[PDB]
Amino acid sequence: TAQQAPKWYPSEDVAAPKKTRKAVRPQKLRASLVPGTVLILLAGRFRGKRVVYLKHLEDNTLLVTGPFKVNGVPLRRVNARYVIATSTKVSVEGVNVEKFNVEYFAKEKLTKKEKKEANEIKTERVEDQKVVDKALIAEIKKTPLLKQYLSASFSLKNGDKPHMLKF
Amino acid sequence: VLKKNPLKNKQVLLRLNPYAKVFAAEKLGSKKAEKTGTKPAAVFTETLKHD
Amino acid sequence: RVKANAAKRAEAKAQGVAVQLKRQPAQPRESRIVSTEGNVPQTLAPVPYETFI
Amino acid sequence: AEQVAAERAARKAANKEKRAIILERNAAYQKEYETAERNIIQAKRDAKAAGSYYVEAQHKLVFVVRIKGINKIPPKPRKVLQLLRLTRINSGTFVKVTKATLELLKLIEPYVAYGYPSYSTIRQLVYKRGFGKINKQRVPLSDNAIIEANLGKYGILSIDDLIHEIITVGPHFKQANNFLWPFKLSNPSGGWGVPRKFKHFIQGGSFGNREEFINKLVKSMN
Amino acid sequence: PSRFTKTRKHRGHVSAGKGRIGKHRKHPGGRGMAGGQHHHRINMDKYHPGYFGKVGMRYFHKQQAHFWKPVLNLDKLWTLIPEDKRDQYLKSASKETAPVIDTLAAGYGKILGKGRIPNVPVIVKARFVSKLAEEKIRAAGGVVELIA
Amino acid sequence: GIDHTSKQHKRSGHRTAPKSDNVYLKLLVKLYTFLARRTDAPFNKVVLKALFLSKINRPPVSVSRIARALKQEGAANKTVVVVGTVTDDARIFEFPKTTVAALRFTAGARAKIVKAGGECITLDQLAVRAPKGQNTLILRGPRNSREAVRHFGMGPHKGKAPRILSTGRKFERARGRRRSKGFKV
RNA sequence: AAAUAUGUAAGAAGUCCUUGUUACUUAAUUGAACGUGGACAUUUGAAUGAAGAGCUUUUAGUGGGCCAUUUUUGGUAAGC
RNA sequence: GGAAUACUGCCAGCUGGGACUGAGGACUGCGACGUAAGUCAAGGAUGCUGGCAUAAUGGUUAUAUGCCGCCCGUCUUGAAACACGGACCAAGGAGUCUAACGUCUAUGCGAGUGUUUGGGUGUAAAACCCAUACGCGUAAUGAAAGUGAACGUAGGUUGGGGCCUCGCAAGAGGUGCACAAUCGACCGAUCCUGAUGUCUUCGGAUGGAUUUGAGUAAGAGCAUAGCUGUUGGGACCCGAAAG
């Protein structure tokens, strides 16, 4: 032989894991996040956008609308730690958001075979945007300058201290 | 396999002390004291304020 | 002390009051009440420097 | 012989009998601790109202924390620190206050900071840093059964029974104290409160008899 | 075997177990038995008292054959009898059948009375005997006849 | 740092798992490492501990030493256990009917016990017969009767058998051993 | 005439009651020493701790020392 | 005169943010909430989601940066030393063998042990087999002439593992190997004492002694082997002025 042998061999059966006691419980969002509040996006494609908070989805995310007509932000979901909850609020009564859920936002992840060598939107997702923002744009008008406020991006100026600012 | 602290992890505290439930329910940590009206004698105050 | 222990144990064996033959070290003093009846505290002060020669 | 519930119920029921005893014992200790404190508080007032002074009973228990390290120690203080089981820096031990022991603490003053512990300090020490010397091994208590199996000969059935034997120096203080491993305390969280430690607490350092201020230091180290 | 020695273990260590001060030398204290009444005096007295001086009278031309006298004690006295016949003399513990044990034929010069032969009479032939050795043989019924 | 009161990482100082490569002795150890653990009988721990002993720590036990031990009151019908060697004694002429368990029996010792109606058994036959050491009598041979022990602790005024090769007159029988020649020891 | 150092003791190999031995001792069954029988057990003779206790054999290296607080000799003093 | 606040202390009062860690691997335990089913933060981390699936993470290596780092060996109380050896590289280079021994350990036999000087034999320096001797041990003590180990269950006492009897147990009793202390007995030497007797000068029974031995008191040794230590040998290696 080149190597003689291991005189005792180890078993090859995988042992089951023990009974774990990590039970899932609903997340307690911070009190500043109440539906209808205006949010400022901190990261992503639409960071710096002031945006309206509608609903708390099942997978710990927030259902949020621009509205799209105002600043070009569609019906998305965002992480709760990537937004700033502002004091300004707009009413969401008359807006039906029970339809939207986790399965509403699905990607149908592409296969590894499909390769983008060099390089659309669902018809119902466009129509769902028009239904929600129609009942929400009307609620904006009662507050003056609110449409202009939501249409302008947020940014930090020289001397702005986030630890001292109020949003 | 792991030491879980009492004084936190209230489950472990309840395991060690069955009285911890009664102690919390009766607010025995903030028990009031009945008011007494005793007053120190004239000698004690005079000695205390003596030059 | 040995013969005093045997007599103490034998005498107290008739009624069994936990004879307690072991010696003990000096224990801390208990509480007490000290009165000022004729014992009003006398105020003392440090003295200034002198020569005394 | 299934024996999965015929004997399981017998142990489960017998467990309830022990828990009930602990619950009523701990209830009586709370009534005993509170009664003594109010009586002492009232006794000071009544003597003041009667014109006399109340002289409290001298303290019977101290908690000793070794402050000095292990190098460059004279033999006699080093021998005493071993007889108090203080073989490490920031290690604690309860001592019965007698004449035979107060001379021990006089020999190790430059190396220990001690004082009179309160019920809060003793309770938080044993609950968090309480370890039993079982079969010459340092075993976390973590359960009444470990105390029951070893200290049960002296009527100590739970962790509160053991604590009651420390705050009140009882007939079996020695057996309960030695049953406890020396406490392994950390460094104080807010610091030592002084620039230099190796002076007397009176002179402005850390070591010596700090009477009731030991509770503040110990809790920070606990 | 050299592979189990401490020489194979001291490879890489400078002094090979001899010390940096001791500096293993040729003969730091002398050769053989040098200094017996001198710097090796304590070891001699403690461990070999009586080494020096002379104690007795000489003997020129001592032949260690005038002194050949191996001693046999009475406690055996029966290992000389073959074990095959040894048994039946114990039951036949009578005279006129007493076995004859020639100690000289077994290579012994004197018989000493260490003790406790059985109560069987026996004939013992020997060159020399001790006083107590014979008293036990005569008490057991046997006799001691001297040979040369 | 710790003010270590006692030596750290110190071994017990007792032999376990005896250093002999005898496979049959390791089997007897394996049988008594089981009995000692699971029978909580003091006998099984003494025998197992005695199985680790070196040659000088299990001296032979003669048959006369076995016979004398059976003369003790009430020990006539006890099983003699000798972890070691049983040798033969010609100094005794009567041997009782008894059972002896030992590691080894010399040829003379076996004949003496067998001829008297007794039986010689091994320690594993004792285990199946007396698993808890019932009615046993453990015997030990003399330890300090060895020749080497005479020379341990040599010193003045001790009478401790000088380590000598040749004896007789003019071999260490002189100054240091009589007042006539200097001093006496 | 201190302080600091230092010896001994704080029990079972002990205490108590009765009587056995002897060639020592006593004016003397008086002692001395060792005993038989009986009574006294985990608070069984202060505290603290004990990490096991006790015992043996054998052999290595070493046998130039130096420094510091304190006591101290010689020397004016010295990193003497 | 009535309150408040400070300060100190307690709560088995509540609650927000940050950091590091996730060891173990079917179940068993101690607990908590519910009438129950069951559930739980109760003897150690899980659930959901994304991008990538490739030198991206990562290993190596050179460089740069921040901080740190004096030349190794040696004698010495003290070496980076203005103490000594070392310009560099390859190869060689220093506790070995033998005779006789001590302690320990392994092995076989065991009051015995050693076949190997030699003889027989052989598949021929091997292997196998064997007689008489002899070495050591089984008796010591004396300078020697000489003598030479049981009053007694091979003794008494104090401990003593284990075993046996009773006891649920704790404990009580019996027996107690090895071993430890002690008091005795026996053997040899020394100093005494000196019976029956007699070649009347031999013999040495009997009984003692703060004397002595490397002794006895139901034997342990012999043989081989290993580490370690000792001695003589060149003796761990190299080194005189000499004769």
Swiss-Prot record, chain C:
Keyword entries, A-Z: Cytoplasm, Isopeptide bond, Ribonucleoprotein, Ribosomal protein, Ubl conjugation
Principal location: cytoplasm
One Gene Ontology cellular component annotation held by this UniProt entry: cytosol
Cell compartment(s), UniProt: Cytoplasm
GO biological process, one term: cytoplasmic translation
UniProt keyword Nuclease, yes or no: no
Family statement: Belongs to the eukaryotic ribosomal protein eL21 family.
Subunit and partners: Component of the large ribosomal subunit (LSU). Mature yeast ribosomes consist of a small (40S) and a large (60S) subunit. The 40S small subunit contains 1 molecule of ribosomal RNA (18S rRNA) and 33 different proteins (encoded by 57 genes). The large 60S subunit contains 3 rRNA molecules (25S, 5.8S and 5S rRNA) and 46 different proteins (encoded by 81 genes).
Functional note: Component of the ribosome, a large ribonucleoprotein complex responsible for the synthesis of proteins in the cell. The small ribosomal subunit (SSU) binds messenger RNAs (mRNAs) and translates the encoded message by selecting cognate aminoacyl-transfer RNA (tRNA) molecules. The large subunit (LSU) contains the ribosomal catalytic site termed the peptidyl transferase center (PTC), which catalyzes the formation of peptide bonds, thereby polymerizing the amino acids delivered by tRNAs into a polypeptide chain.
Note: There are 2 genes for eL21 in yeast.
Protein name: Large ribosomal subunit protein eL21A
Protein species of origin: Saccharomyces cerevisiae (strain ATCC 204508 / S288c) (Baker's yeast)
Residues of the full protein shown: 108 to 160 of 160
Curated annotation (Swiss-Prot), chain D:
Any one of the GO CC terms: cytoplasm
Alphabetical UniProt keywords: Cytoplasm, Ribonucleoprotein, Ribosomal protein
Subunit structure as annotated in this protein's UniProt entry: Component of the large ribosomal subunit (LSU). Mature yeast ribosomes consist of a small (40S) and a large (60S) subunit. The 40S small subunit contains 1 molecule of ribosomal RNA (18S rRNA) and 33 different proteins (encoded by 57 genes). The large 60S subunit contains 3 rRNA molecules (25S, 5.8S and 5S rRNA) and 46 different proteins (encoded by 81 genes).
Protein's recorded name: Large ribosomal subunit protein uL30A
Superkingdom of origin: Eukaryota
Known role: Component of the ribosome, a large ribonucleoprotein complex responsible for the synthesis of proteins in the cell. The small ribosomal subunit (SSU) binds messenger RNAs (mRNAs) and translates the encoded message by selecting cognate aminoacyl-transfer RNA (tRNA) molecules. The large subunit (LSU) contains the ribosomal catalytic site termed the peptidyl transferase center (PTC), which catalyzes the formation of peptide bonds, thereby polymerizing the amino acids delivered by tRNAs into a polypeptide chain.
GO molecular function, one term: RNA binding
Alphabetized Gene3D superfamilies for the sequence: Ribosomal protein L30, ferredoxin-like fold domain
Keyword Ribosomal protein appears in the UniProt entry: yes
Record GO biological process: cytoplasmic translation; maturation of LSU-rRNA; maturation of LSU-rRNA from tricistronic rRNA transcript (SSU-rRNA, 5.8S rRNA, LSU-rRNA); ribosomal large subunit biogenesis
Subcellular location: Cytoplasm
Main location: cytoplasm
NCBIfam families: uL30_euk
Swiss-Prot record, chain E:
GO molecular function annotations of the record: RNA binding; structural constituent of ribosome
InterPro entries registered for this protein in UniProt: Ribosomal_uL15, Ribosomal_uL15/eL18, Ribosomal_uL15/eL18_sf, Ribosomal_uL15_CS
Protein name: Large ribosomal subunit protein uL15
Localization annotation: Cytoplasm
Location of cross-link Glycyl lysine isopeptide (Lys-Gly) (interchain with G-Cter in ubiquitin): K95
Highest taxon, organism lineage: Eukaryota
Classification of source organism: Eukaryota, Fungi, Dikarya, Ascomycota, Saccharomycotina
Quaternary context: Component of the large ribosomal subunit (LSU). Mature yeast ribosomes consist of a small (40S) and a large (60S) subunit. The 40S small subunit contains 1 molecule of ribosomal RNA (18S rRNA) and 33 different proteins (encoded by 57 genes). The large 60S subunit contains 3 rRNA molecules (25S, 5.8S and 5S rRNA) and 46 different proteins (encoded by 81 genes).
Keyword rRNA-binding part of the UniProt annotation: no
Organism field: Saccharomyces cerevisiae (strain ATCC 204508 / S288c)
Described purpose of this protein according to its UniProt entry: Component of the ribosome, a large ribonucleoprotein complex responsible for the synthesis of proteins in the cell. The small ribosomal subunit (SSU) binds messenger RNAs (mRNAs) and translates the encoded message by selecting cognate aminoacyl-transfer RNA (tRNA) molecules. The large subunit (LSU) contains the ribosomal catalytic site termed the peptidyl transferase center (PTC), which catalyzes the formation of peptide bonds, thereby polymerizing the amino acids delivered by tRNAs into a polypeptide chain.
Residue runs in coiled coils: none
GO biological process, one term: cytoplasmic translation
Family recorded in the similarity comment: Belongs to the universal ribosomal protein uL15 family.
Curated annotation (Swiss-Prot), chain F:
Location of N6,N6,N6-trimethyllysine modifications: K49
Compartments (UniProt record): Cytoplasm
Family annotation (SUPFAM superfamilies): Ribosomal proteins L15p and L18e (SSF52080)
Keywords: Cytoplasm, Isopeptide bond, Methylation, Ribonucleoprotein, Ribosomal protein, Ubl conjugation
GO BP field: cytoplasmic translation
An annotated GO cellular component: cytosolic large ribosomal subunit
Transmembrane helix among keywords: no
Pfam families: Ribosomal_L18
Cross-link (Glycyl lysine isopeptide (Lys-Gly) (interchain with G-Cter in ubiquitin)), chain numbering: K115
The keyword ATP-binding belongs to this UniProt entry's keyword annotation: no
A GO term for molecular function: structural constituent of ribosome
Main location: cytoplasm
Extra remark: There are 2 genes for eL18 in yeast.
Entry-linked PANTHER family: 60S RIBOSOMAL PROTEIN L18, LARGE RIBOSOMAL SUBUNIT PROTEIN EL18
Role played: Component of the ribosome, a large ribonucleoprotein complex responsible for the synthesis of proteins in the cell. The small ribosomal subunit (SSU) binds messenger RNAs (mRNAs) and translates the encoded message by selecting cognate aminoacyl-transfer RNA (tRNA) molecules. The large subunit (LSU) contains the ribosomal catalytic site termed the peptidyl transferase center (PTC), which catalyzes the formation of peptide bonds, thereby polymerizing the amino acids delivered by tRNAs into a polypeptide chain.
Family statement: Belongs to the eukaryotic ribosomal protein eL18 family.
Name the UniProt record assigns to this protein: Large ribosomal subunit protein eL18A
Name of the gene encoding the protein in the UniProt record: RPL18A
